[PDB]
Amino acid sequence: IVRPVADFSPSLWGDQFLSFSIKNQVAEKYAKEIEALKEQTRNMLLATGMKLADTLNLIDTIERLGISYHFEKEIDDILDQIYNQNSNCNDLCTSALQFRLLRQHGFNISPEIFSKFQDENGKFKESLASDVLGLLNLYEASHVRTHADDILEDALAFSTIHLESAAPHLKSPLREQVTHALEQCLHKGVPRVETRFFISSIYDKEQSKNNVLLRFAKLDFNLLQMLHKQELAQVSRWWKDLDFVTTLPYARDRVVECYFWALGVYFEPQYSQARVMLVKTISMISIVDDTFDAYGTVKELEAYTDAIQRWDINEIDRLPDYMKISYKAILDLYKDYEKELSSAGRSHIVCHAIERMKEVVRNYNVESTWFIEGYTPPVSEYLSNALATTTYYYLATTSYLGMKSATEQDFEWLSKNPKILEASVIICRVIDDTATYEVEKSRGQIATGIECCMRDYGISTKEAMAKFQNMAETAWKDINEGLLRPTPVSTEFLTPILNLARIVEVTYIHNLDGYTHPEKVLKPHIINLLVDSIKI
Ligand SMILES: CC(C)=CCC/C(C)=C/CC/C(C)=C/COP(=O)(O)O
Ligand SMILES: [Mg+2]
Ligand SMILES: [Mg+2]
Ligand SMILES: [Mg+2]
């Protein structure tokens, strides 16, 4: 058996994350100050007699500064009041902000709030083209539409062209904020990534900045960063003691990138256990993926697939030595999860993730069979298999394991492939297929998504990519609609799914692959989130 040649770049991080010793004095000092700043900020939110515009700008600022997770109740009460008073008498910037904040929080505010800014034709009044703050908030708002918001169909094009036109002559930091928004809208960005940018590049440089909020935002970001570094060290240790880097040398060494992904799903301190569980699963399914993609023979992958379905340590002997390694590691990981969830009486939920992993592996094997046969399925058949191979049903399920408040009913809802989950999975599938089409085509993978699309509909590569882009836009509208009240489960269990879609958009930004090639996209984010603190 002549295996393929090892082609993955080594981890670019070395051991720089392996050992992090927290300074308790600094941590305790930060925590104590934050407690005081947190109360000052609460009183700012609860101030009586504030105008609508000032209230919305305060909430927006606290959200972008990344400290809104301290004020979920206060912010919810205030937006709920604004939603129910149905105030509809403002300029474009307050109106667009009002619409975006309410929708992001699941309040189904009517899009008719935008009619007064449009002509008879439903097109935005071009006279608004010189109101840069209106255009900027309209722009951000355009990304939260559902299928019921066709009144906003023109908003992205309109605001984009006039923001591009205005940008070079804007003062700083507004210019940098506009320029940044045109590359990465807020609603589809990774929250920590956008927070780090806003704090350091924008709010820190605003003439009108509130000093209490800025100091609060920097201390809190740097304090949470200490936690993230501890987690990453603990996970780096775990990965090192498995030593796949030498026993399974065909496989990508990407535990830092995997941690960044888990950090994108949730950054808050109460999700520490959930993050560590999640990153271990992303790491491990990545190994399995490389086993199917870049090492195993058809015969070996069959045995591996069947062994996974039966899920029993008895089965290791049917496997080649090198597969014994990952298989025992997989089984042990899930035994660890059960043990770690035992004191909370939540061990029994691990089976939900196990069943999703089995599904991923079944579909991995189908994908291998297709490649070997030179099969090009129709799109419907392609999708029936390739949606699960995104791993996104599996990761979403995994993200619930460490969430203390996730119940059996939450897992039951997720097992039915709800619409919002399906949309998130679709976004991952079509964006990766658009970005990795050329490579996969070079490797002979004739069952890749865009190829299936071209052959099925009889259209060009360009037209197929346009069709996949439409699928992503439709899926984003479904995600946005999936967040609207009443939600089928607590919003706490929707946000991970939204954040999985965001991570996709951020990792494949401008359409190149970012996990297998972390040098382009992910490296700067990892440095800004997990290496450099924000200077105070
Ligand atoms: C499979 C891996 C590396 C999972 C861990 C990181 C992750 C969640 C990536 C996004 C999911 C996709 C689209 C993976 C594409 O794998 P293929 O090139 O088709 O074998
Ligand atoms: Mg792969
Ligand atoms: Mg694969
Ligand atoms: Mg791909």
Coordinates of C-alpha atoms and ligand atoms in Angstrom, one line a residue:
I1 CA 0.0 0.0 0.0
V2 CA 1.5 3.3 -1.2
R3 CA -0.1 6.1 0.8
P4 CA -0.4 9.7 -0.5
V5 CA 2.4 12.1 0.4
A6 CA 2.0 14.4 3.4
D7 CA 1.1 17.8 2.1
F8 CA -0.2 19.8 5.1
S9 CA 1.8 22.7 6.4
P10 CA 3.0 22.3 10.1
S11 CA 1.5 24.2 13.0
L12 CA 2.8 27.7 12.8
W13 CA 2.4 28.2 16.5
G14 CA 5.0 25.8 18.0
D15 CA 4.7 25.6 21.8
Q16 CA 3.9 29.3 22.5
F17 CA 0.5 28.4 23.8
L18 CA 1.3 25.2 25.8
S19 CA 1.9 26.9 29.1
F20 CA 0.1 30.0 30.4
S21 CA 0.5 31.1 34.0
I22 CA -2.2 33.6 35.0
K23 CA -1.1 36.5 37.2
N24 CA -3.7 36.3 40.0
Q25 CA -2.9 39.8 41.2
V26 CA -3.6 41.4 37.8
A27 CA -6.7 39.1 37.3
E28 CA -8.1 40.0 40.7
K29 CA -7.4 43.7 40.3
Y30 CA -9.2 43.7 36.9
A31 CA -12.2 41.8 38.3
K32 CA -12.6 44.2 41.2
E33 CA -12.5 47.2 38.9
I34 CA -14.8 45.7 36.4
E35 CA -17.4 45.1 39.1
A36 CA -17.4 48.8 39.8
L37 CA -17.4 49.8 36.1
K38 CA -20.2 47.2 35.5
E39 CA -22.5 48.9 38.1
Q40 CA -21.7 52.4 36.6
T41 CA -22.6 51.0 33.2
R42 CA -25.8 49.4 34.5
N43 CA -26.9 52.8 35.9
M44 CA -26.2 54.4 32.5
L45 CA -28.6 51.9 30.9
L46 CA -31.3 52.3 33.5
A47 CA -31.2 56.1 33.3
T48 CA -34.6 57.7 32.9
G49 CA -35.6 60.3 30.4
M50 CA -33.2 59.2 27.5
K51 CA -34.1 60.0 23.9
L52 CA -34.7 57.0 21.6
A53 CA -31.5 57.8 19.6
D54 CA -29.3 58.0 22.6
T55 CA -30.7 54.8 24.1
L56 CA -30.1 52.8 20.9
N57 CA -26.6 54.2 20.5
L58 CA -25.7 53.3 24.1
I59 CA -27.0 49.7 23.6
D60 CA -25.2 49.5 20.2
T61 CA -22.0 50.7 21.7
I62 CA -22.1 48.4 24.7
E63 CA -22.8 45.5 22.3
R64 CA -19.9 46.4 19.9
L65 CA -17.6 46.9 22.9
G66 CA -18.3 43.2 23.7
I67 CA -19.7 43.8 27.2
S68 CA -23.4 43.4 26.6
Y69 CA -23.3 39.8 27.9
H70 CA -23.3 41.5 31.4
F71 CA -26.6 43.3 30.7
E72 CA -28.8 40.8 28.9
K73 CA -31.8 41.5 31.1
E74 CA -31.5 45.3 31.0
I75 CA -31.0 45.4 27.3
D76 CA -33.8 43.0 26.7
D77 CA -36.2 45.1 28.8
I78 CA -35.3 48.3 27.1
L79 CA -35.6 46.9 23.5
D80 CA -38.9 45.2 24.5
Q81 CA -40.2 48.6 25.5
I82 CA -39.0 50.2 22.3
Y83 CA -40.6 47.3 20.3
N84 CA -44.0 47.7 21.9
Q85 CA -44.2 51.5 21.8
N86 CA -43.7 51.3 18.0
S87 CA -42.1 54.7 17.7
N88 CA -41.9 55.5 14.0
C89 CA -40.9 59.1 13.6
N90 CA -37.1 59.3 13.2
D91 CA -34.2 59.9 10.7
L92 CA -32.5 57.1 8.8
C93 CA -29.7 56.3 11.2
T94 CA -31.9 55.9 14.3
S95 CA -34.5 54.0 12.2
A96 CA -32.0 51.5 10.7
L97 CA -30.3 51.0 14.1
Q98 CA -33.7 50.5 15.8
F99 CA -34.6 47.9 13.1
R100 CA -31.3 46.0 13.4
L101 CA -31.1 45.8 17.2
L102 CA -34.7 44.7 17.5
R103 CA -34.4 42.0 14.8
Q104 CA -31.0 40.8 16.2
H105 CA -32.8 40.3 19.5
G106 CA -35.8 38.5 17.9
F107 CA -38.3 41.3 18.0
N108 CA -40.2 41.2 14.7
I109 CA -40.3 44.9 14.0
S110 CA -42.1 45.7 10.7
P111 CA -39.8 46.7 7.8
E112 CA -42.4 49.4 6.9
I113 CA -40.3 51.7 9.1
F114 CA -38.2 52.2 6.0
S115 CA -41.1 53.3 3.7
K116 CA -40.7 57.0 4.5
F117 CA -37.1 56.7 3.2
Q118 CA -38.2 55.4 -0.2
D119 CA -40.1 56.7 -3.3
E120 CA -43.2 55.4 -4.9
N121 CA -41.1 52.7 -6.6
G122 CA -39.9 51.2 -3.4
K123 CA -36.3 52.5 -4.1
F124 CA -34.4 54.4 -1.4
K125 CA -34.4 58.2 -2.0
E126 CA -31.1 59.1 -3.5
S127 CA -31.3 62.4 -1.5
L128 CA -30.2 60.3 1.5
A129 CA -26.9 59.6 -0.3
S130 CA -25.1 62.4 1.7
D131 CA -26.1 61.1 5.2
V132 CA -23.2 58.8 6.0
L133 CA -24.3 57.7 9.4
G134 CA -27.7 56.8 8.0
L135 CA -26.1 54.9 5.2
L136 CA -23.8 53.0 7.5
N137 CA -26.7 51.9 9.8
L138 CA -28.8 51.0 6.8
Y139 CA -25.9 49.0 5.5
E140 CA -25.6 47.0 8.7
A141 CA -29.4 46.6 8.9
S142 CA -29.5 45.2 5.3
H143 CA -27.8 42.0 6.6
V144 CA -30.6 41.0 9.0
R145 CA -33.4 40.6 6.5
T146 CA -35.8 37.7 6.4
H147 CA -37.9 36.6 3.4
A148 CA -40.6 39.0 4.5
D149 CA -38.4 42.0 4.1
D150 CA -38.2 42.5 0.3
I151 CA -38.8 46.2 1.0
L152 CA -35.1 46.2 1.9
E153 CA -34.1 44.5 -1.3
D154 CA -32.2 47.6 -2.6
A155 CA -30.7 48.6 0.8
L156 CA -27.4 46.7 0.5
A157 CA -26.6 48.0 -3.0
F158 CA -27.8 51.6 -2.3
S159 CA -25.8 52.0 1.0
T160 CA -22.8 50.2 -0.4
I161 CA -22.3 52.4 -3.4
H162 CA -22.6 55.6 -1.5
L163 CA -20.5 54.6 1.4
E164 CA -17.7 53.6 -1.0
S165 CA -18.1 57.1 -2.6
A166 CA -18.0 58.9 0.7
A167 CA -15.3 56.9 2.5
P168 CA -12.0 58.5 1.3
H169 CA -13.0 61.9 2.6
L170 CA -14.4 60.9 6.0
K171 CA -12.7 61.9 9.3
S172 CA -11.1 59.2 11.5
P173 CA -12.1 56.8 13.0
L174 CA -15.4 57.0 11.0
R175 CA -13.5 56.3 7.8
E176 CA -11.9 53.2 9.2
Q177 CA -15.3 52.0 10.6
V178 CA -17.0 52.5 7.2
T179 CA -14.1 50.9 5.3
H180 CA -14.1 47.9 7.7
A181 CA -18.0 47.5 7.5
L182 CA -17.8 47.2 3.7
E183 CA -15.3 44.2 4.1
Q184 CA -17.1 42.7 7.1
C185 CA -20.6 43.5 8.2
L186 CA -21.3 43.4 11.9
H187 CA -24.2 40.8 11.9
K188 CA -22.1 38.1 10.1
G189 CA -18.8 38.7 11.8
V190 CA -17.3 36.6 14.7
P191 CA -18.3 38.6 17.9
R192 CA -14.8 38.6 19.6
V193 CA -13.2 39.5 16.3
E194 CA -15.5 42.5 15.7
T195 CA -15.3 43.5 19.4
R196 CA -11.4 43.5 19.2
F197 CA -11.5 45.7 16.1
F198 CA -14.1 48.1 17.5
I199 CA -12.4 48.6 20.9
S200 CA -8.9 49.2 19.5
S201 CA -9.4 50.7 16.1
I202 CA -12.6 52.7 16.5
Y203 CA -13.9 53.4 20.0
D204 CA -10.4 54.1 21.4
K205 CA -10.0 56.8 18.8
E206 CA -13.4 58.5 19.0
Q207 CA -13.4 62.1 20.2
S208 CA -16.8 61.5 21.9
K209 CA -15.9 58.1 23.5
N210 CA -17.2 57.4 27.0
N211 CA -14.2 56.8 29.2
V212 CA -16.0 54.5 31.6
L213 CA -17.2 52.3 28.7
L214 CA -13.8 52.2 27.0
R215 CA -12.0 51.2 30.2
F216 CA -14.6 48.6 31.0
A217 CA -14.4 47.2 27.5
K218 CA -10.5 46.9 27.6
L219 CA -10.3 45.3 31.1
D220 CA -13.1 42.9 30.4
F221 CA -11.6 41.8 27.0
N222 CA -8.2 41.3 28.5
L223 CA -9.6 39.5 31.6
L224 CA -11.5 37.1 29.4
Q225 CA -8.5 36.7 27.2
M226 CA -6.6 35.3 30.3
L227 CA -9.3 32.6 30.6
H228 CA -9.1 31.8 26.9
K229 CA -5.3 31.4 27.1
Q230 CA -5.7 29.0 30.1
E231 CA -8.2 27.0 28.2
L232 CA -6.0 26.9 25.1
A233 CA -3.0 25.8 27.3
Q234 CA -5.1 23.0 28.8
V235 CA -6.2 21.9 25.4
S236 CA -2.7 22.2 23.9
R237 CA -1.5 19.9 26.8
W238 CA -4.3 17.4 26.0
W239 CA -3.3 17.4 22.3
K240 CA 0.3 17.0 23.1
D241 CA -0.3 14.0 25.3
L242 CA -2.2 12.3 22.5
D243 CA 0.8 12.8 20.1
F244 CA -0.9 12.4 16.8
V245 CA 1.7 14.8 15.4
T246 CA 4.1 11.8 15.3
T247 CA 1.9 8.7 15.3
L248 CA -0.6 10.0 12.7
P249 CA 1.7 12.3 10.7
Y250 CA -0.6 12.4 7.7
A251 CA -3.0 14.6 9.7
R252 CA -3.3 18.4 10.1
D253 CA -1.9 19.8 13.3
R254 CA -4.5 22.6 13.9
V255 CA -5.6 22.6 17.6
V256 CA -5.1 26.4 17.8
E257 CA -7.3 27.0 14.8
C258 CA -9.8 24.5 16.3
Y259 CA -9.8 26.6 19.5
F260 CA -10.5 29.8 17.5
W261 CA -13.5 28.0 16.0
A262 CA -14.8 27.0 19.5
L263 CA -14.2 30.6 20.7
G264 CA -16.3 31.9 17.8
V265 CA -19.2 29.7 19.0
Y266 CA -19.1 31.3 22.5
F267 CA -16.6 33.4 24.3
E268 CA -18.3 34.0 27.6
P269 CA -16.8 32.6 30.9
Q270 CA -19.9 30.5 31.7
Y271 CA -19.2 28.5 28.5
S272 CA -15.6 27.5 29.5
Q273 CA -16.4 23.8 29.9
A274 CA -18.5 23.8 26.7
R275 CA -15.6 25.4 24.7
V276 CA -13.0 22.9 25.8
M277 CA -15.4 20.0 25.0
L278 CA -16.1 21.5 21.6
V279 CA -12.5 22.1 20.6
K280 CA -11.6 18.5 21.4
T281 CA -14.4 17.3 19.1
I282 CA -13.3 19.6 16.2
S283 CA -9.7 18.4 16.7
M284 CA -10.7 14.7 16.7
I285 CA -13.2 14.9 13.7
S286 CA -10.5 16.7 11.8
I287 CA -8.2 13.6 12.3
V288 CA -11.0 11.3 11.1
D289 CA -11.5 13.6 8.1
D290 CA -7.8 13.4 7.1
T291 CA -8.0 9.6 7.5
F292 CA -10.7 9.5 4.9
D293 CA -9.2 12.2 2.7
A294 CA -5.5 11.7 2.7
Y295 CA -4.4 8.3 4.0
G296 CA -6.8 5.4 4.3
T297 CA -7.6 2.9 1.5
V298 CA -11.1 1.9 0.6
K299 CA -10.9 -1.4 2.4
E300 CA -9.5 0.3 5.6
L301 CA -12.2 3.0 5.5
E302 CA -14.9 0.4 5.3
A303 CA -13.7 -1.3 8.5
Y304 CA -13.2 2.1 10.1
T305 CA -16.8 3.1 9.2
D306 CA -18.3 -0.1 10.5
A307 CA -16.3 0.0 13.7
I308 CA -17.7 3.5 14.4
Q309 CA -21.3 2.4 13.8
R310 CA -20.8 -0.4 16.4
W311 CA -18.9 1.9 18.9
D312 CA -17.3 -0.8 21.0
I313 CA -13.7 -1.2 22.1
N314 CA -14.0 -4.9 21.0
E315 CA -13.8 -3.6 17.4
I316 CA -10.2 -2.2 17.5
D317 CA -8.7 -5.6 16.3
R318 CA -10.5 -5.4 13.0
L319 CA -8.6 -2.2 12.3
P320 CA -5.0 -1.4 11.1
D321 CA -2.6 -0.3 13.8
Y322 CA -2.8 3.3 12.8
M323 CA -6.6 3.4 12.9
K324 CA -6.6 1.7 16.3
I325 CA -5.0 4.9 17.5
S326 CA -7.7 7.4 16.5
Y327 CA -10.5 4.9 17.3
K328 CA -9.5 4.3 20.9
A329 CA -8.9 8.1 21.2
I330 CA -12.4 8.8 20.0
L331 CA -14.0 6.3 22.3
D332 CA -12.0 7.5 25.3
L333 CA -12.9 11.2 24.5
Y334 CA -16.6 10.4 24.8
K335 CA -16.0 8.4 28.0
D336 CA -14.3 11.6 29.3
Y337 CA -17.3 13.7 28.4
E338 CA -19.6 11.3 30.2
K339 CA -17.4 11.5 33.3
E340 CA -17.0 15.3 33.2
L341 CA -20.8 15.6 32.9
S342 CA -21.5 13.1 35.7
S343 CA -21.8 15.4 38.7
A344 CA -24.3 17.6 36.9
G345 CA -26.4 14.4 36.1
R346 CA -26.0 15.2 32.4
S347 CA -24.0 12.2 31.2
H348 CA -26.9 10.7 29.3
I349 CA -26.9 13.5 26.7
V350 CA -23.5 12.5 25.2
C351 CA -25.2 9.9 23.0
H352 CA -26.7 12.7 20.9
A353 CA -23.3 13.8 19.8
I354 CA -22.2 10.2 19.3
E355 CA -25.1 9.6 16.9
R356 CA -24.2 12.7 14.9
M357 CA -20.6 11.6 14.7
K358 CA -21.7 8.2 13.4
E359 CA -23.7 10.1 10.7
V360 CA -20.6 12.1 9.7
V361 CA -18.5 9.0 9.3
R362 CA -21.2 7.2 7.3
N363 CA -21.2 10.1 4.9
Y364 CA -17.4 10.4 4.8
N365 CA -17.4 6.8 3.5
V366 CA -20.1 7.5 0.9
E367 CA -18.0 10.5 -0.3
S368 CA -14.9 8.2 -0.6
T369 CA -17.0 5.7 -2.6
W370 CA -18.1 8.4 -5.0
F371 CA -14.5 9.6 -5.5
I372 CA -13.2 6.1 -6.3
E373 CA -16.1 5.3 -8.7
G374 CA -15.8 8.7 -10.4
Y375 CA -19.4 9.4 -9.6
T376 CA -21.0 12.8 -10.1
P377 CA -24.4 12.8 -8.3
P378 CA -27.2 15.4 -9.0
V379 CA -27.3 18.3 -6.6
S380 CA -30.2 16.9 -4.5
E381 CA -28.3 13.6 -4.0
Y382 CA -25.0 15.5 -3.5
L383 CA -26.6 17.6 -0.7
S384 CA -28.3 14.6 0.9
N385 CA -24.7 13.3 1.7
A386 CA -22.5 16.4 1.7
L387 CA -24.5 18.5 4.2
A388 CA -23.5 16.2 7.1
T389 CA -19.8 16.1 6.0
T390 CA -19.6 19.8 6.9
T391 CA -19.7 18.4 10.4
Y392 CA -22.0 21.2 11.3
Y393 CA -25.0 19.1 12.6
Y394 CA -22.4 17.3 14.7
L395 CA -20.6 20.5 16.0
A396 CA -23.9 22.2 16.8
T397 CA -24.9 19.1 18.8
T398 CA -21.5 19.1 20.4
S399 CA -21.8 22.8 21.4
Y400 CA -24.7 21.9 23.7
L401 CA -22.8 19.2 25.7
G402 CA -21.1 21.7 28.0
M403 CA -24.0 24.1 28.3
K404 CA -25.4 23.5 31.7
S405 CA -28.9 24.6 30.9
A406 CA -29.3 22.4 27.8
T407 CA -32.0 19.8 28.3
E408 CA -33.1 16.6 26.6
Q409 CA -35.9 18.6 24.9
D410 CA -33.3 21.0 23.4
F411 CA -31.3 18.0 22.0
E412 CA -34.6 16.5 20.7
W413 CA -35.4 19.7 18.8
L414 CA -31.9 19.8 17.3
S415 CA -32.1 16.1 16.3
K416 CA -35.0 16.9 13.9
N417 CA -32.7 19.1 11.8
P418 CA -34.6 22.4 12.4
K419 CA -34.6 25.0 9.7
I420 CA -32.1 27.4 11.4
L421 CA -29.6 24.5 11.8
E422 CA -30.1 23.4 8.2
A423 CA -29.5 27.0 7.0
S424 CA -26.2 27.2 9.0
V425 CA -25.2 23.8 7.5
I426 CA -26.1 25.0 4.0
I427 CA -24.0 28.1 4.4
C428 CA -21.0 26.1 5.4
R429 CA -21.5 23.7 2.5
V430 CA -21.9 26.2 -0.3
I431 CA -19.3 28.6 0.8
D432 CA -16.7 25.9 1.3
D433 CA -17.7 24.4 -2.1
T434 CA -17.2 27.8 -3.8
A435 CA -13.9 28.3 -2.2
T436 CA -12.4 24.8 -2.5
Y437 CA -13.8 23.9 -5.9
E438 CA -10.6 24.5 -7.9
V439 CA -8.3 22.5 -5.5
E440 CA -10.7 19.5 -5.3
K441 CA -11.1 19.6 -9.1
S442 CA -7.3 19.3 -9.4
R443 CA -7.3 16.3 -7.1
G444 CA -9.8 14.5 -9.3
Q445 CA -12.8 15.0 -6.9
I446 CA -15.5 15.0 -9.5
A447 CA -18.3 14.8 -6.9
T448 CA -17.5 18.2 -5.5
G449 CA -20.5 20.6 -5.1
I450 CA -19.9 23.0 -7.9
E451 CA -19.2 20.2 -10.3
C452 CA -22.4 18.4 -9.4
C453 CA -24.2 21.7 -9.9
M454 CA -22.6 22.4 -13.4
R455 CA -23.4 18.8 -14.6
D456 CA -27.0 18.7 -13.1
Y457 CA -28.2 22.1 -14.5
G458 CA -26.0 22.2 -17.6
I459 CA -24.5 25.6 -16.6
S460 CA -20.9 27.1 -16.3
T461 CA -18.7 27.2 -13.2
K462 CA -19.6 30.9 -12.9
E463 CA -23.4 30.3 -13.0
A464 CA -23.0 27.4 -10.6
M465 CA -21.2 29.6 -8.1
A466 CA -23.9 32.3 -8.5
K467 CA -26.5 29.6 -7.7
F468 CA -24.6 28.5 -4.6
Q469 CA -24.3 32.1 -3.6
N470 CA -28.1 32.4 -3.8
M471 CA -28.4 29.4 -1.6
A472 CA -26.3 31.1 1.0
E473 CA -28.4 34.3 0.9
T474 CA -31.6 32.3 1.2
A475 CA -30.1 30.4 4.2
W476 CA -29.1 33.7 5.9
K477 CA -32.7 34.9 5.6
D478 CA -33.8 31.6 7.2
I479 CA -31.3 32.0 10.0
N480 CA -32.5 35.6 10.6
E481 CA -36.2 34.4 10.6
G482 CA -35.2 31.5 12.9
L483 CA -34.2 34.0 15.6
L484 CA -37.6 35.8 15.7
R485 CA -39.8 35.4 18.8
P486 CA -41.4 33.1 19.8
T487 CA -38.3 30.9 19.4
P488 CA -38.8 27.1 19.5
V489 CA -36.0 26.8 22.1
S490 CA -34.3 29.4 24.3
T491 CA -32.2 31.9 22.3
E492 CA -29.2 30.6 24.2
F493 CA -29.4 27.5 22.0
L494 CA -29.8 29.4 18.7
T495 CA -26.8 31.7 19.1
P496 CA -24.2 28.8 18.7
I497 CA -25.9 28.0 15.4
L498 CA -25.8 31.5 14.2
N499 CA -22.1 31.7 15.3
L500 CA -21.3 28.6 13.4
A501 CA -22.5 30.4 10.3
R502 CA -20.5 33.5 11.1
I503 CA -17.4 31.5 11.6
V504 CA -17.9 30.1 8.0
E505 CA -18.2 33.6 6.6
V506 CA -15.2 34.9 8.5
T507 CA -12.9 31.9 7.7
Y508 CA -13.7 31.9 4.0
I509 CA -13.8 35.7 3.6
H510 CA -13.1 36.9 0.0
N511 CA -13.4 33.2 -1.0
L512 CA -10.2 31.4 0.0
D513 CA -9.9 28.5 2.5
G514 CA -8.9 29.5 6.0
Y515 CA -8.6 26.4 8.2
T516 CA -6.4 24.3 6.0
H517 CA -4.5 27.5 5.1
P518 CA -4.6 29.4 8.4
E519 CA -1.8 31.7 7.3
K520 CA -4.0 34.0 5.2
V521 CA -7.2 34.4 7.2
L522 CA -7.0 33.0 10.8
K523 CA -3.5 33.9 11.9
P524 CA -4.2 37.6 12.4
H525 CA -7.4 36.8 14.3
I526 CA -5.7 34.3 16.5
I527 CA -2.9 36.9 17.3
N528 CA -5.5 39.6 18.1
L529 CA -7.7 37.3 20.3
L530 CA -5.2 35.0 22.0
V531 CA -1.7 36.6 21.8
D532 CA -1.8 40.4 22.0
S533 CA -3.7 42.1 24.8
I534 CA -5.5 45.4 24.1
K535 CA -3.2 48.2 25.3
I536 CA -4.6 50.4 28.0
Ligands
LIG1 C1 -13.2 18.7 8.0 C2 -12.7 19.6 9.0 C3 -11.2 20.1 8.8 C4 -13.4 20.0 10.1 C5 -12.8 20.9 11.2 C6 -12.9 22.4 10.9 C7 -14.2 22.8 10.3 C8 -15.5 22.7 11.1 C9 -14.2 23.2 8.9 C10 -15.5 23.6 8.2 C11 -16.2 22.4 7.7 C12 -15.8 21.9 6.3 C13 -16.5 22.5 5.0 C14 -14.8 21.0 6.1 C15 -14.3 20.6 4.7 O1 -13.6 19.3 4.8 P1 -13.2 18.6 3.4 O2 -12.1 19.4 2.7 O3 -14.3 18.5 2.5 O4 -12.6 17.2 3.7
MG2 MG -10.6 17.0 4.3
MG3 MG -13.2 15.2 3.9
MG4 MG -14.4 21.5 0.1

